[model samples]
Target chain A: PGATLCLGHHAVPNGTLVKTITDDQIEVTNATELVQSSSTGKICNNPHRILDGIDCTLIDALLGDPHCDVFQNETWDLFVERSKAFSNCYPYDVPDYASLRSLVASSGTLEFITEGFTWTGVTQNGGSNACKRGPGSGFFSRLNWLTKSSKGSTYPVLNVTMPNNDNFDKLYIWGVHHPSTNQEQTSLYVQASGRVTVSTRRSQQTIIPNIGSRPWVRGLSSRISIYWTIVKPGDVLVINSNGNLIAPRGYFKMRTGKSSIMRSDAPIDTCISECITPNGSIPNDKPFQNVNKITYGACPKYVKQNTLKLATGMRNVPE
Target chain B: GLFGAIAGFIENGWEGMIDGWYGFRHQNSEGTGQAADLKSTQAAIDQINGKLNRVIEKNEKFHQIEKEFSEVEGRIQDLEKYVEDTKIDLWSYNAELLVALENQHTIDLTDSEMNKLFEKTGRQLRENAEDMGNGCFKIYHKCDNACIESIRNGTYDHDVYRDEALNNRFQI
Candidate 1:
């Protein structure tokens, strides 16, 4: 029986055609997992690409490989730790707008604030867990959601504008917030950049080779998957909890721009807890003073390199 | 320059399609009136051209200002980086020294070298204090510290970033 198999947008290759019910559905078998799809299912079939019609020039400038989720790899772990510590470049000792005015346009959040920062996005289970680490606010571990997931998902939720044509090194991530769930399940999917309001299109596109380090989401079986991809300036990074087009559970947008990150003169905690608080006070406290100040920025050079390496790691954590 | 103003009457008022047709007919008429109207139109064009020329002439000045602003912005970015780096260096220096002291290390530096490092390190603190002085003045003059008061009375009921950094270091 002639049957079409699809993982997300692309067709499933060498998917052993198990059985196909006349125009109803098809059962395909692979080495590790079983895939069943409605023969007429338009879900993955003919899915809406974020970048469609026009071809995207894939650009892979990330260190090591960004095609996988290497969140636990040494390099990747270093990257996350460094990123959590310095979302806004290295601390400015004096820590003021004057000092912020002058600095290298390295990949970080200071560039965002100095260059008019605004955020627009949606997230569920986006808050920190006081219980996980026990005591104060939880350790900013949005990564371990697969193992100990929170209630909400940090989806691509904002649209940002920046220097029309500029180069940026990193695209920091945003996570979702949620309480405990009734179900114990984890799913990860990558959304093809279909059409983001025609604001900017990818000028280059390249695939990474040798990505055994990518984070592989379980429950879906031994299928290796890419957790993160290198996004260029002007290209929008849309992170969604579920790849489902219909009523996605969570989402957020990481808009890339020309802002560079530099080390701050002062040492400030750029962690999830102390990161975006411009009003600069309180933890788990209500009516965030400068919630507007709490926007995502880029990771630095070496940290980016490490993250790029980890981005290539494909194995997801177990429950 | 007044030619535009004069033409404004023709363009904005009593200048519907019918008026336009009337003007055309009047200008095209075979008489001295036509010549006079044509001459008037030329004079208006020439006047506007002169005005436009002056406006265009200011472009260089504006561009020069832009160049100056860009240079200033660059300097600002550099100073920021300088201050930021030096501050980090100082923080690291202190932290390292603290750790060394804690770990039982007799770390010492020459006085002259320490002076030089501090001269560089203290640049931002001085500059920031100066800026903050001016800023506080402006704040006092603006709303008599109304904004600061509001910031102090932050929406976060349990938060005291203002109260903590309230004094002067311009913290919080």
Candidate 2:
């Protein structure tokens, strides 16, 4: 290390990768520059003002996504409280969309009507192993997106199976926007499929093709995160931006409800993971560049179609 | 005995002068924090000084308080009589209060204590105001338009400042 390691530690622990969020202490480094309060309860009744005015708001409003179908609003609220049942110190619990909409929808608890340019933080979405970003990208959000603990959100499934053994019940999301950029060109989609683990490290990982440090025609570059909950078992993880769910061909642990599958369908072209070609599945070692490490527990008997090239500046760790 | 009495009188007067100067210096030395930042009326601040002088006179520090009062009063009178903006130094008013306050609670002060002082001082000072806005307390520092308009006028509750800058109240 060429420079002194200016490490920051906080009582603000890492967050749950699932959709539920907590109002906890946010420990900070560089106290003179960025001082976050310890008195966290619920995020503001009106979240838009905190994000715009202070440039400091937890992205918990993802619970308000109009598309959220599972748990409706009531069950999701119960799920959150149940998850925190073990904790004695947790003083507050955020409710589901319906209950929240009933109270804080238009009450106007706080205001920041100062005439100023709005900071539209452009963002992208995807599931990453380390909850990290590529070169020139900012610090990542949603660090824990793939924990399959029994305490996670549970749901009934339709017919489809998870590609790898890694469950899709809990998924965390994070994204960023460079200066002067709108959110239109920057977006992402998440679909539960077979475990898509790259056998290669760094240069050989699955790199999100659309993300970039684009030209800053105006404003400052910033990052944003969210707590997206109620991902059901049978309910498909639909990402709105990428036009298609990831279609992979390789050895995977697939599951539907309590049932599990044995192999990668090796689907091509179609958005569904079950579709397979005559040439067979896309091998586990297929994606080379930007692929840091293939870390899932499952691997097939044969090496199938693949090429892995590492991006020189990439790593798969605590950097 | 006569010579010793004269010497004590001369030394007592010198102590008075230093105490007055110390008051001014103390007020001027207040860097940027809440006690110095509270808004108050000038007439009320003068009353506080009179009360403060009474306290110090009982404690043998009155000689200094009286000397400081004379000098600061003369300066304020000159600013008023001459009608010159250049001579209106806010520090002249701030110094006496700053010295008295800092000396009063150097060790046992908390934010609640400061808030208590603020409320006590604010109510006492308001009794002498000619008008609400005319002689109201403003920051000694020349804050920009937005800070003055929003924070000083009490219209803007800066949540940004509340989230980002609040240290004293964050824990409490």
Candidate 3:
């Protein structure tokens, strides 16, 4: 008998294919026991990018590579540890408009003013652990529903406009709020990357490259993704909880303009997002959770290198 | 000069359109009597030009000249009065801009040069104190004590970005 393969987003349209599903959503971790410092901490994966500066490990999964998941998770753990403590750029510092550190948007509530800011709890963050983190008031991690996640996020939800922002060296990652299912999950599926050259059409359409360093979401084996699209002087960096696109119009909280990003050069640059669209292959219940953090900025890769020459790290915690 | 010429073109086009229209509900058309009068039209154009020439002529009696200083004096004052009545904050976005310049660090400059740059930075700080993160229709921050405290204590809100900062402003 002839059989058909049912790859997600595609099908043989005939015979049925087999698929397996599981949930290992990373848990909202408490400060863990120290091992290698890296192993002891929670892992935070950036959108669909691998540590070697390649692509998602999902590429390996799709291509039938046996060890994709293993390497992905291993690197995911490394990145989570690495990101927790910044070596170069200050992940929290933002420009004129600081990165949002709260829910920012939602239906029921109106305004949320917390220890230092005011926001509307629209955009969702974390998961329910109500008995634990309490109500997020405006701190998304504290919301009635968002309470559960121990996977705390400290993404640069915003990137303030600055001179030399157009420089390529800066990583320009927005606060990444992924919603993965578990510890073993594959990376999120980025439809495309904002990490391209044009605004409307992506110059380099990429499949999630199977890189050893990318974070892999387990249930459906998805990963986080980002973009580098051309935008106007004050365009908004709208993001989704899942799918990746450059300058997505509605989901994000910050604006991207010559003035907004804090730079004046006209060359198009890539900026990452903090939120996920919360769509596709992964199951909902795992530690592969989401977050909505403060809108903020970071320097260009080169500038970051330059800045690091004089500065001390934000958290005394070593990488 | 490019801007002035474009404005002139648009104004002339608008006037021509308004002048050539026939039958207002009351019926009957009105000739842009003066513009329709060939010689008169030239005369009017000449008059405006003459006035502009006078204004240009008034531009400074200068030793080292970089700016053209002149005026249609009385005519321009009237125009300015009309603008004031119109209530246009002609140079509005200055404060919006000043805020942006101050929100980051300066790496390339020497420490001393950095201090000098921050003089402008300080001005921007004070000016944009009002609308830090409130993404609304406010510009120019008055960095009173409250704003300074926010910066010193390391905090800011999101409300001052009411939309728009594309700088082909001259094209407008």
Candidate 4:
């Protein structure tokens, strides 16, 4: 008894053949449980009733109706064994850039990495004992603020330029940095299409004398909401440390182009922490790589369809 | 006294007689006499009267212009009120249509399609629904299922039936 029977909405997983009652009917017993009290009944053979041309033989019982087309000519055990190898299609499996755009436009965020490149440290300034000190120092060091009487002397300014091509529709940069000698964290929001807007916080430090001998160093930070900056290709973005000497960390999400190349006025090493393409992540060996020339290519067209276990029993009924 | 009076009369004539009676300077004693002064004064009065009449005419013209301006201002206010009322009515209609679309699902649609449809304006929504045929009428105007079936089976013209359904629903 190794055949499944589909009845109405429920399926008989392990049915036993009792006898051939007629040319179109057969008496069967539910091996698992008695569905209608006596467990033996004469069932009619319809187009959707029997499985594998068997009148009534049940080895395994499942809850819903069988998806006959999906089952194909394979047995239930073999079909289930093959289903373990099925895989799902993700955003990286999308065929073209237009599909990626449509998916992003609909969902706001795609599962794929849309950011061109992300750098951990772009610029840094410190003493000789710190991580390479002035120029070409790619890592941020806490030793710059740990020293004495060396706060205001270090001002690092970074100049970033957009690529000299109109391959991109829009650009968004979310940057985080230490803006002052006190090492206060601040965020920068930069967006560019034609009219660019850059918003960042500025720090103002003042020393006020206390009632005693010591003076209180008060630091005030406020946000500069809008900067009227027009950005085009070949235009330079002058990002200053404002008052401190520290590096900035951020990622750029470009609509249609790759990440823009940046060069600092001071000697700085731009190191990419993460680089993602449309296909997936690529390996980066150069720790001090300054320029990013990697571009995203089209995704694969073929995606494996994920397999789902079909329940046996009533096709439309809950029970 | 009689001789003196006779000599004064011979020298002054009416001036002497008026001066002797009134005991003040006579008008004839002044330069250019009384007739010339009276003519000049009358000319000045006539000039002043003419200027006053012209000023009165200008004031009347200004009043007429002010009345016309007030009428225009009233019409403008009425037009502005009408425009404001029209805007409110349009906004109300859009709100009602949006509510109806949000509540009713006459056709089977995916969540993505529904979201995209929601993003359109009320007029765009209506046009899209009209282009798609009968779905919006079924939802908003309570179109008869028989009519929909007839249209589906090619027994009735879609455009004609849709209009008739709308007219029947609206009693127009």
Judged by TM-score, which candidate is best? 4
True-structure RMSD for candidate 2: 34.7
Worst 10 residues of 2 chain A by lDDT: A1-10
What is candidate 3's lDDT per residue for A3-34, written digit by digit as tens? 99885322222222222134222212122211
lDDT for each residue of candidate 2 in A87-191, tens digit (9 for 90 to 100) = 111011232323332222222221111111111121213333212234322222212122121333221111122212234332322221111222422222122
Per-model fnat list: 0.17, 0.00, 0.00, 0.00
Chain A vs. native, model 4, TM-score = 0.21
Please state every model's RMSD to the true fold in angstroms.
Answer: 39.6, 34.7, 38.0, 47.0
Model 1, A1-319: lDDT tens digits are 6998876333343343222235232324232212111111111101111111011111111111122212211210001111122111110012232322222222212111122333333322222222223343322222222222233543342344433234643232222221122131223212222112212244322221111122222111121112222345556533323321111122112232333222211223323432211122123322122223322222111111111111112222222
Candidate 3, TM-score of its B chain: 0.17
Model 3 lDDT tens row, B81-157: 44664343333545455435432211111222323322332344333323222111132333345443343233533
DockQ of each candidate relative to the true complex: 0.07, 0.00, 0.00, 0.00
Q: What is the C-alpha lDDT of each candidate?
A: 0.26, 0.22, 0.24, 0.22
Summing lDDT over every window of 10 consecutive residues in candidate 2 chain B, give the lowest-scoring window.
B59-68
Question: In model 1, which regions exceed 4 Å deviation?
Answer: A1-123, A127-170, A174-183, A186-200, A203-319, B1-172
Give the chain B TM-score for each candidate: 0.19, 0.19, 0.17, 0.20
Stretch of 10 with least lDDT, candidate 4 chain A? A1-10
Model 4 CA deviation exceeding 4 Å by range: A1-155, A160-166, A174-236, A242-319, B1-172
**A62-87 per-residue lDDT for model 4 (tens digits):** 10012211222222200011111221
Model 4 C-alpha RMSD vs. true structure (Å) is 47.0
